Design a protein around this ligand. Sequence first.
Ligand SMILES: O=C(O)CCC(=O)C(=O)O
Ligand code: NA
Lengths: 368, 368
Amino acid sequence: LPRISVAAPRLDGNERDYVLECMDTTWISSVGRFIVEFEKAFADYCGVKHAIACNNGTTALHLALVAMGIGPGDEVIVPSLTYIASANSVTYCGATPVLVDNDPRTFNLDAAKLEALITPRTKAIMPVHLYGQICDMDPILEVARRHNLLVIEDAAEAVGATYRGKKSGSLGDCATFSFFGNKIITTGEGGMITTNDDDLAAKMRLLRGQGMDPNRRYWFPIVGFNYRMTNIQAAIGLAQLERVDEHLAARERVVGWYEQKLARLGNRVTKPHVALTGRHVFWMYTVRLGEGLSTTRDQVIKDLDALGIESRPVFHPMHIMPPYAHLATDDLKIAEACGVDGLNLPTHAGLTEADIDRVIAALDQVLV
Amino acid sequence: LPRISVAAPRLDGNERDYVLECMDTTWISSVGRFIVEFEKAFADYCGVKHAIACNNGTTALHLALVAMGIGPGDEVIVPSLTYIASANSVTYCGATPVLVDNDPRTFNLDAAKLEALITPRTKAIMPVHLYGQICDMDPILEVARRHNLLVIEDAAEAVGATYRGKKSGSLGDCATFSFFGNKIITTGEGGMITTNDDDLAAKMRLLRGQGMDPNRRYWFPIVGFNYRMTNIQAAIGLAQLERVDEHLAARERVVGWYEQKLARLGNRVTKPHVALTGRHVFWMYTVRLGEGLSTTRDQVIKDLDALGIESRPVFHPMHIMPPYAHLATDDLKIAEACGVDGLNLPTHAGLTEADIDRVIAALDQVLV
Ligand SMILES: O=C(O)CCC(=O)C(=O)O
Ligand code: NA
């Protein structure tokens, strides 16, 4: 009865060897060939001109927002249903998160609720691509265009997804990714900013390397950060990136298994809706439990654990947690409902059909 | 003639082994054995109860200040002569750096200039142990206690140093260290906070880990950061620490060669003064050029370079660079003088007596 983990990394390419070179060469810091190579390759992978390697997906967002000039006073629209760093990133800038409702099916920012939230202080919108699925960008871009707003994609959970022929990371003014341990591709901890804007790219690199002038060593023209990725993180990321497609394929296999087995559950869960706008990379396989259940989402998590199956609740809405309770509105209903009923199911490259079978059997038993 | 670099990581212990283990077991993110082991060993090496591993020494500083509650309106006294991360860290809290001059001999915070800088807003004093030498702690602690201020040691360059029987890191309310690539101990990029106070340590672990309750996964009681160290960085760190005494001895030898051979340069340099307060670990061997010279400090660095020898200027005082020029005062004269004539010479564990001979001969050639 081996436990089943919601996530896990699969280092099945050149990771070990590339890490070895770093070690052998003594290039373990924030300078080395893999950083540039990883940035170049990631940039190509997304179809953009620039890729900026960061220490994590959280600092990437911060660094991206600061480079964009988000600061005190400014409002950034962010979905209440998201991972907390989306909101915190805005907060670190001294700026103000303005929460917006999501779609009840895709879990993503509802473009129809944006216009109403725009004010004289709005500067940007941060669509977050939940669970490997790109928000409906066209409408979002169109609203930003109309209001002269920046669009920053939090693409943390979406490496590889596409929207109407474009890869995540290539849609807003800039985008951020995470390579945290459980991500589609990992570096253990690591992040990336993508953009086509030369000027934003330069300011990002300037702020990443402590605010030091790249053309005047030891001289610091602005206040910056230490947000650099190491050559080792870059080594692991490059090797992961080389097998991105294989990694992508493995999740699709796992997802195909859930999808072929779901009737066993009936109307007891609603399977994740796939918008027909491009590839959904399924960082996580997310269901919405039946309101009709006597049991609670939280109990269900406890019961699956008891059956050695790991699962987690969908992100608690920002506005229901202490840091952002004050940002609550009466127009965050869908987010609340998903926060109530949402359940992330184990989705990782190493899960087997038998494991998926176990997961379904347990849900069948616990969904009461 | 290979080039002589000012610093360089000596990975001549178990770094490779420990790292390979992380790769082979897949533990390459911010959870794992090495993290806890490294924190454990480090806390013991410093003689304190807690050590909190972070992704760098700059975020370490930020994290510790936030944990001690530094925020908007507060003032922290920081020497103008330091690496800019010292001041930036306060800046990130939205607090105000209050610059103080240093000793002309040790390059450290001048305790005698502290009191007059204290105001109703002061919350803390940040002594920085430059070049591996601990500031004169007792007088500084004397002033702080009298004014009920916190003390936070920026111990980035002084792992291993001691002061009147105590290791760097055990002296203030908390302290920070850097394992950047050129540091006494390196993890490539890495940092650590040390403290004896249980609650400060807990709050520090709370913030480090995205502000998530260690007791209620997925729940976020406060706004935190992503400042965690990877298991890979901790693995390197632990292997470095296992050989800390050898690393320091190596530097001692090198320093000894300097002490002996520097005679050849006569009054053309002023050798680093060493306080008899405890061990000066010599992150860098720092001279101040003779006033009698006709050459300039920047020119000597260029001439050494052309001769294949790396050196660097003593840090530029904060108040003379754009970000902090607004905090300039007329009582920062020693820091300005040191910045003008200060030169860091190669100092690292891989240097031979011959290498040192070479640096001195080059200095004999360029100090005109
Ligand atoms: O780049 C950093 O984060 C620190 C730089 C530093 O300590 C140095 O160059 O001596
Ligand atoms: Na002179």
